[PDB]
Nucleic acid binder design. Structure first.
Ligand SMILES: [Mg+2]
Ligand SMILES: [Mg+2]
Ligand SMILES: [Mg+2]
Ligand SMILES: [Mg+2]
Ligand SMILES: [Mg+2]
Ligand SMILES: [Mg+2]
Ligand SMILES: [Mg+2]
Ligand SMILES: [Mg+2]
Ligand SMILES: [Mg+2]
Ligand SMILES: [Mg+2]
Ligand SMILES: [Mg+2]
Ligand SMILES: [Mg+2]
Ligand SMILES: [Mg+2]
Ligand SMILES: [Mg+2]
Ligand SMILES: [Mg+2]
Ligand SMILES: [Mg+2]
Ligand SMILES: [Mg+2]
Lengths: 80, 129, 150, 82, 123, 205
RNA sequence: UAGCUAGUAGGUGGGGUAACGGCUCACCUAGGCGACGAUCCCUAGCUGGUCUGAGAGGAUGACCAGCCACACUGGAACUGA
RNA sequence: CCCGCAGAAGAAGCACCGGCUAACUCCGUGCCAGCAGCCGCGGUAAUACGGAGGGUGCAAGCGUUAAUCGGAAUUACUGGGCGUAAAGCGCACGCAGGCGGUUUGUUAAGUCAGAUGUGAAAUCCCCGGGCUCAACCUGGGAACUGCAUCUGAUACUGGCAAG
C-alpha cells in the first residue's frame, strides 16, 4: 500500500501543473490546543483532469520539476 | 450559547449543592447520562432519572452526608476549544485517590481507576472529588 | 502537650492629638503535637504583654486536623486574603519544607514531612490563617467513605 | 572499508578498548556502525574482562568486514569453538 | 488570555540590560585614567568621595570610585576596573581595583586585606 | 583539612560533649563546658529558627570531624538513596572507617583513630586502608596492623572502651584486635539527642 | 521591513549529469511566493547534550561524539572512486 | 604499589560579625575619614568607619568581579490579572479564524490500545562491578516524553447520511 494525502485544489493555471492545499491538525508543543495547519504542494496533473476546488488525492514521487514532486492519483470530488 | 453542555451539568450540581437544593434538572443526552451514572456508582449523587419522551429531562438527585454536601468540589477538565486526552499511564489521580476523574474511553465512560486498570486511556471530563 | 511558637511581632502606631502612640502586636500559634493548632494574635503597650495575652487566644479555640501519620492526608491548597498556600504530603523523612509562618504552624500541628510552597501575600498574619484553613480542607480517606457508600 | 577494531575509552594509564565494527576512514574513537563486544587489558581475574559475541562478528566479517591484528587475536585467545 | 491569544502572540520575555556596560561581560577592564576628582555625594550623605575618570581599553570613558583611605592615582595612571556602582555617586557604576596595576593599595590596612589589595603584614 | 584546634571549644558551642577529647578522666569540667563558648559566651542569646538548624547541623558535623564540603556530598547521597534521607545521612557517617575504628575500641577518640587509619595502622578485610572517609560495608572485618597492634595508644584506647558504651551492631574481638561489621546501625541504636531532619531541612533552604 | 518574483512558475522539445530536475537553452503559456508572515534588516554554525529548575520551562551549544562549512582574500578548473 | 630510615618534624589561610545572616566589646574618629547588595551607617560614648581583643563561617583555599537560571505565581502551558491599584477597543456589522443544541447510523482523521521499524554511542537514572576510597572507569537495564507503518477499539471530538 502507499501513503496519499487528499486536499482541495487551490490553483489551476499552469500546464499540467496544479497547486493543492492540505489541512492538518497538530497539538501545540506547549498549549495542547490542536491547530489546523495547511500545506501548499504543486502536484502534477498531466491530463488536467482535475480542476480548481476539486478535492484531489496525490502521492510523493520523483522530482518532476522544481517545487514539484507529487502526482495526482485520482479526484474525489468535482468541486462544489 | 450552549457550546459546552457537559459544563452546564457539572456547574448545575456544584451550584445546587451549595444551594442546598434537593435535586437538580436539565436536558439529558447520552453523554450526560454516562457521567451522571459514574457519579452515582461512586456515591456522589443519590440517584438520577430521565423524564420526558420527545424532550429528554434529567432528574438528578443531589446527595448530602452530614450537615454538609458530598460534592465538595467538581470542575470540568477536557472542555471544548481545548480538548485533553491521556494515556493508560497518564490518567490523573484526583485528590490522591480520595477523588475520581471521569474519563471517556473507547470502552465507555468510566472512572479513572477502572480505565487505568483496563489498560486503556481516553478523554478526561472532570475531577469530582 | 502544648507547643508555643512565636511567629513574629510588629510595632504598629496610633497618632493622636498628643502625638504618635507606640504599641505592639505578636503573632503566635499553639499546637498539641498531633492534630491541634490555633493561631493567637494579640496586641499590647508592652512587647511581652502582647505575647502573653496572645498565647491565651492561641490555646483557646484551636482545631482538629485529620493528620495521617506525620504528613497531610493529601495535597491541599488553602488560602485567605491575598495569601494563597499550597500544601503537599511528602515521604517519611523528607522533613518539613515550608516558608516562615508556614512551618511555624505545621511544626506544632504535628506535621513532620511536607513540601508546601505559599505565594501571593507573604504577610504572616494572613499566611498562617490561610495555612490553618488549608489543613482544615484535607479530609481523611475514612471520611471520604463516610460520604459515599453508606 | 568496514572492519572491526578497538577503541580506547579508559582513564589515563588505565585504558578500556571497545571492539566495534566501523569504517576505516573514521577516526579511532570516532563514528562506528555497531559496538560488538568489549575488551579490558586490566581486570583482576574478575571472572570477566573480554567479550566478543561471535554471532554478530561473523555477520560482518562474512559480509566483507576485516579485523584488527589485536581484536583478531582475542577471537582466538578465547575458545571460539564454544 | 485564552490559549489562542498566546498562540498568535506568545508571552514576551524581557531584556534586562547590564547595570554596568564593562563590555564583553568582562570581570574587569583596564583604563588610562584621564582625571581624578573628589565630587560630593548625594542627598542624605556628605563627604568627598574620591572618584576618577578612567579611559577603558575598548574606549569607554567611564568613572570609578577609589575605595580605602588614601590612594595615589595621578594623571596617566593605568588602572583596572571592577564594576560596583556607588549610590552616593551618580554616573559611577564601576570600582577601581585597588592593589592592581599602577593603582597602589590601602596601607596600614589589616582587617579585610583581600579587598583594597594588601599582602600579609608580617607575622 | 581537619580543624586541628581547641577541640573543647567546639563542644562548648554545641553545649554538649562531642567526645572530641574522649580521654580517660576529664568529661566536662577542666574547660567549663556550658559557660561561654567564647569571650562573650557568658550571655545567653536567642538562636533564630535558622541558627537552630545551622547549629544542629554544625554539631553532628564536627562530631565525626568531617568538613562542610564532604558532609554536603553525604547529604546529596542521603537524598538520592531509595531510603530515608534522615537515617541515610547518619548511617553514611557511621559507615566512615575513621568512625568505625573509633567505635571498636581502637583509638581513644575519633580524631585519634583518624591517624591510625592514615598511618596504615588499620586493615579492612585483609586489606590495608588509610582513607578515614572509607565507607565500611556490612560483614567487613576491621582489624589492626600487628606492627601497630602492640602499639601503646591501641590498648589504652580499649582501656575505657569497655568502660564506655557498646556498638550493638558489630563484633569486636579485643583479643586479636578484630572487629566485624554485623550490620548498619538502625536509627535506634544510633539514636541520641540528635534530630537529623533539622539539618536535612537546612540543606533545602 | 508588506509586498516579493522573468530562467520567475509551469509546459513542450533538444542538451547536460553518476542521477531526478530550468541544471541548461529556444519556443509556449502567465504564472510561482506571501500575515499559517514572503522580501528586507540584524544576530547566529546545528544536534546529541550542558547549566539552572520541584517540574513545565528558561539560558546555552567550551572539552567529548554525529552532521555542516572554511583553509591568506576573490575566482577557476585538473587529476581522481 | 610494598619494605625500611630519621624526626613534630617540612605544610593555614580568606571573608564576615546592625537586620536580611551564623558571629560583640574597647579604643580612635566626630556627616570628617570612610562603608555600602538593599534598608541605610558617620554631625563625641559608632556592635555598621579604622585598629585591637573575642566570635562565626569556609578551607588549600577564601573573598570580589563578570555572567545564566533561581527566588519571580514579576510574560502566569502547569501558573496571574483588567469597577477604583497597570489594564474592556467610544459603539456596531462582519470575512478569515476559534468554538457548536439533539438522535440513529456510518466512517475511523484526531483519540485510545497492541505490535514493528526508528529515535547513534556518550551523558542522565537504577542495579552491579574496577583503580586502597572518592572523583574517575565500566556491564546491563531504564529513558530518549518523539516520527512513521501495521492491526484493532469506537466513548468523546471530526467527516458523511437521514432526521
Ligand atoms: Mg553587583
Ligand atoms: Mg527536459
Ligand atoms: Mg533528453
Ligand atoms: Mg559567527
Ligand atoms: Mg520555579
Ligand atoms: Mg582559495
Ligand atoms: Mg545573628
Ligand atoms: Mg565592613
Ligand atoms: Mg567611640
Ligand atoms: Mg517564571
Ligand atoms: Mg517576592
Ligand atoms: Mg498581578
Ligand atoms: Mg487614577
Ligand atoms: Mg487605572
Ligand atoms: Mg465600553
Ligand atoms: Mg543513546
Ligand atoms: Mg460523531
Amino acid at each position: 500500500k502507499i501513503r496519499t494525502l487528499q486536499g482541495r485544489v487551490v490553483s489551476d493555471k499552469m500546464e499540467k501543473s496544479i497547486v493543492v492545499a492540505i489541512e492538518r491538525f497538530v497539538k501545540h508543543p506547549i498549549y495542547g490546543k490542536f491547530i489546523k495547519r495547511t500545506t501548499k504542494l504543486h502536484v502534477h496533473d498531466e491530463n488536467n483532469e482535475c480542476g480548481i476546488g476539486d478535492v484531489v488525492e496525490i502521492r510523493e514521487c520523483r522530482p518532476l520539476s522544481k517545487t514539484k514532486s507529487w502526482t495526482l492519483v485520482r479526484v474525489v470530488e468535482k468541486a462544489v | 450559547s450552549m457550546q459546552d453542555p457537559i459544563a452546564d451539568m457539572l456547574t448545575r450540581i456544584r451550584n445546587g449543592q451549595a444551594a442546598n437544593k434537593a435535586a437538580v434538572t436539565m436536558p439529558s443526552s447520552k453523554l450526560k447520562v454516562a457521567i451522571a451514572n459514574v457519579l452515582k456508582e461512586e456515591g456522589f449523587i443519590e440517584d438520577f432519572k430521565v423524564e420526558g419522551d420527545t424532550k429528554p429531562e434529567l432528574e438528578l438527585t443531589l446527595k448530602y452526608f452530614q450537615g454538609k454536601a458530598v460534592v465538595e468540589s467538581i470542575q470540568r477538565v477536557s472542555r471544548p476549544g481545548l480538548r485533553i486526552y491521556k494515556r493508560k499511564d497518564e490518567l490523573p489521580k484526583v485528590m490522591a485517590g480520595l477523588g475520581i476523574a471521569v474519563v471517556s474511553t473507547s470502552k465507555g465512560v468510566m472512572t479513572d481507576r477502572a480505565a487505568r486498570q483496563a489498560g486503556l486511556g481516553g478523554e478526561i471530563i472532570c475531577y469530582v472529588a | 502537650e502544648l507547643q508555643e511558637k512565636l511567629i513574629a511581632v510588629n510595632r504598629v502606631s496610633k497618632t493622636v492629638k498628643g502625638g504618635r502612640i507606640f504599641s505592639f502586636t505578636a503573632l503566635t500559634v499553639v499546637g498539641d503535637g498531633n492534630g491541634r493548632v490555633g493561631f493567637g494574635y494579640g496586641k499590647a503597650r508592652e512587647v511581652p504583654a502582647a505575647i502573653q495575652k496572645a498565647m491565651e487566644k492561641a490555646r483557646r479555640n484551636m482545631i482538629n486536623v485529620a493528620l495521617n501519620n506525620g504528613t497531610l492526608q493529601h495535597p491541599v491548597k488553602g488560602v485567605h486574603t491575598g495569601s494563597r498556600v499550597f500544601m503537599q504530603p511528602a515521604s517519611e523523612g523528607t522533613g518539613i519544607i515550608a516558608g516562615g509562618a508556614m512551618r511555624a504552624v505545621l511544626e506544632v500541628a504535628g506535621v513532620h514531612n511536607v513540601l508546601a510552597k505559599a505565594y501571593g501575600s507573604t504577610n504572616p498574619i494572613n499566611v498562617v490563617r490561610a495555612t490553618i484553613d488549608g489543613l482544615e480542607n484535607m479530609n481523611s480517606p475514612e471520611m471520604v467513605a463516610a460520604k459515599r457508600g453508606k | 572499508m568496514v572492519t572491526i577494531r578497538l577503541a580506547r575509552h579508559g582513564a589515563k594509564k588505565r585504558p578500556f578498548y571497545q571492539v566495534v565494527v566501523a569504517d576505516s576512514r573514521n577516526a579511532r574513537n570516532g563514528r562506528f556502525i555497531e559496538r560488538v563486544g568489549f575488551f579490558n587489558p586490566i581486570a583482576s581475574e574478575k571472572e570477566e574482562g573480554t567479550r566478543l559475541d561471535l554471532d554478530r562478528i561473523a555477520h560482518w566479517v562474512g559480509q566483507g568486514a576485516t579485523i584488527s591484528d589485536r581484536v583478531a587475536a582475542l577471537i582466538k585467545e578465547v575458545n571460539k569453538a564454544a | 488570555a485564552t490559549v489562542n491569544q498566546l498562540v498568535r502572540k506568545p508571552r514576551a520575555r524581557k531584556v534586562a540590560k547590564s547595570n554596568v556596560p564593562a563590555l564583553e561581560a568582562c570581570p574587569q577592564k583596564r583604563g588610562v585614567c584621564t582625571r581624578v576628582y573628589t565630587t560630593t555625594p548625594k542627598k542624605p550623605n556628605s563627604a568627598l568621595r574620591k572618584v576618577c575618570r578612567v579611559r577603558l581599553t575598548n574606549g569607554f570613558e567611564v568613572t570609578s570610585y577609589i575605595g580605602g583611605e588614601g590612594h595615589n592615582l595621578q594623571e596617566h595612571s593605568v588602572i583596572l576596573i571592577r564594576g560596583g556602582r556607588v549610590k552616593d555617586l551618580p554616573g559611577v557604576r564601576y570600582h577601581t581595583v585597588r592593589g592592581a596595576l599602577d593603582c597602589s593599595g590601602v596601607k596600614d590596612r589589616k582587617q579585610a586585606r583581600s579587598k583594597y589589595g594588601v599582602k600579609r603584614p608580617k607575622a | 583539612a581537619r580543624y586541628l584546634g581547641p577541640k573543647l571549644k567546639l563542644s562548648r558551642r554545641e553545649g554538649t560533649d562531642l567526645f572530641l577529647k574522649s580521654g580517660v578522666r576529664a568529661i566536662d569540667t577542666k574547660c567549663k563546658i556550658e559557660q561561654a563558648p567564647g569571650q562573650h559566651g557568658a550571655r545567653k542569646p536567642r538562636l533564630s529558627d535558622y541558627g537552630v538548624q545551622l547549629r544542629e547541623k554544625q554539631k553532628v558535623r564536627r562530631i565525626y570531624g568531617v568538613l562542610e564540603r564532604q558532609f554536603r556530598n553525604y547529604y546529596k547521597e542521603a537524598a538520592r538513596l531509595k531510603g530515608n534521607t534522615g537515617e541515610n545521612l547518619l548511617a553514611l557517617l557511621e559507615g566512615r572507617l575513621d568512625n568505625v575504628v573509633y567505635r571498636m575500641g581502637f583509638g581513644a577518640t575519633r580524631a585519634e583513630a583518624r591517624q591510625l587509619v592514615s598511618h596504615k595502622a588499620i586493615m579492612v578485610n585483609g586489606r590495608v586502608v588509610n582513607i578515614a572517609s572509607y565507607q565500611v560495608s556490612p560483614n567487613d572485618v576491621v582489624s589492626i596492623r600487628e606492627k601497630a597492634k602492640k602499639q601503646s595508644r591501641v590498648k589504652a584506647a580499649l582501656e575505657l572502651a569497655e568502660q564506655r558504651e557498646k556498638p550493638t551492631w558489630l563484633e569486636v574481638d579485643a583479643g586479636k584486635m578484630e572487629g566485624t561489621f554485623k550490620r548498619k546501625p538502625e536509627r535506634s541504636d544510633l539514636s541520641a539527642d540528635i534530630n537529623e531532619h533539622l539539618i536535612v531541612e537546612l540543606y533545602s533552604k
